[PDB]
Each structure stands twice: as C-alpha cells, then as structure tokens.
C-alpha cells in the first residue's frame, strides 16, 4: 500500500514519533506498513503495533458505545442508527485490518512462544471487539474464533512461560473479560482471574525489582476486576 516506498526502519521511527504526538491513526498506518515489509517483528515493534491499533479501536469502541446508548434510548428518524452503523463499519474495518496482518503472515512465521502467544492474544482481542458489536447470523462464530485464539494462547503460555510473564497475565485478564461479558460465563471469568492472580503471587519471589513492578501492575488489574465482579 501507501507505505511500500518507505524504509522499514523509517516506518518504525515515525511510529514512535506519532506515539509521542498522540497520532495513533498515523502510528497504525506506519506499523501496518512495517508489518507488510514481511519481516518478523521484534518485541518492541510488536508493542508498537498493539498500542497503535488499541488506541485507534479504543476511540471507535467508546464512540460506538455512546451512540448505541443514544440509539436504545430512542427505541424506548434514521440518523442515530445511520451514524452508529457508520462508526461500527469503520470499527469493523480496523478489526479486519489487524486480523489480516496476523493471518498474513505474523502468526505462521511466529515460532517463539513469546511472539506466538502475543499474536494469538491480539487475534482474540480483535475477534472480541467484533463480537461486541455483532448481532447476526455469524455472531456465534465470531465469539468462537475469539475463544479459540485465546485458548491456544493460554495453552502455549502455560507450557512455555512463567506465571508472572506480563503477556501471559494480560492474556489472562482479557480472556477473563471475554468470559464475563462476551461468553456470558461470569463464573469462568472469576475463576480464571483468581487462579491467575494467585499463581503469579506465588512466583513473584523469583523476580527482579523491575520485573516485579511489571507483573504486579497487571495483577492489580486482575484484582480490580475481581473487586468489581464479586
């Protein structure tokens, strides 16, 4: 696409500038172009990819939720529905764009557990975002695609990563929220959050001061959700 004529390193460099400038749509286009260069991504580059699309899709979701609430209140002219559809279609485009990158070809080229777990979590996250707005003939299939990606990531992380690994913890956090609010399995969500928190606590003693802070930062988010749900 439109980034094919820019160097890979230049795209990475500008993605970092766009992050500092809080230009996340630019950040995403740059990391999209970097991925399409066809080289595997380093740990840092993988985080730049995730952060960019998280913020882009994060604004769309928040906008979708505002409009969706207005729409439902109006159902207690066509403009409210039309504009919610517009935002929704745009949100689905970004989700399809990320899933296209993971499928072509970040996942199949990711042999390391750290990189493969990272991409499969992302895959579950963006099928979940599609699920948040799905309503029709293939909602169930979208949900199952999220479940399956999350489940493979959990199996690999369990085998290949320590219980305090921040990616394993973030994955567990998001799989738990999937269970709670997407799969209507609130008790699965609570068990997973609790078991994840406890097994990380039992492993903190092996960690350095820096890794300790990374892990506990995410253990607190698990605790926050547990506190909200019980």
């Amino acid at each position: 696409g439109a980034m094919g004529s820019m160097e890979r390193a230049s795209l990475i460099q500008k993605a970092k500038l766009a992050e500092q400038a809080e230009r996340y749509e630019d950040m995403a286009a740059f990391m999209k172009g970097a991925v399409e260069k066809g080289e595997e991504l380093s740990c840092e580059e993988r985080n730049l990819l995730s952060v960019a699309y998280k913020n882009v899709v994060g604004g769309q979701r928040a906008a979708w939720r505002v409009l969706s609430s207005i729409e439902q209140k109006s159902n207690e002219g066509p403009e409210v529905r039309e504009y919610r559809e517009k935002v929704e279609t745009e949100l689905q485009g970004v989700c399809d764009t990320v899933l296209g990158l993971l499928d072509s070809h970040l996942i199949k080229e990711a042999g390391d557990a750290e990189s493969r777990v990272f991409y499969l979590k992302m895959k579950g996250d963006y099928y979940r975002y599609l699920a948040e707005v799905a309503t029709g003939d293939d909602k169930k299939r979208i949900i199952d695609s999220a479940r399956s990606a999350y489940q493979e990531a959990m199996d690999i992380s369990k085998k290949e990563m320590p219980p305090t690994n921040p990616i394993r913890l973030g994955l567990a956090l998001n799989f738990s929220v999937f269970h709670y609010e997407i799969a209507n399995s609130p008790e699965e969500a609570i068990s997973l959050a609790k078991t994840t928190f406890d097994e990380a606590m039992a492993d903190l003693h092996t960690l350095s001061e820096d890794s300790y802070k990374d892990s506990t930062l995410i253990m607190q988010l698990l605790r926050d959700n547990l506190t909200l749900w019980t």
């Binding site: 996250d125 956090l173 609010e181 988010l221 959700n225 909200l228």
Partner: peptide, 5 residues
C-alpha cells in the same frame, strides 16, 4: 468503574 483490559 468500567472493567479493565
């Protein structure tokens, strides 16, 4: 609050 991801 809104749950966290």
């Amino acid at each position: 609050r809104r749950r966290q991801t």
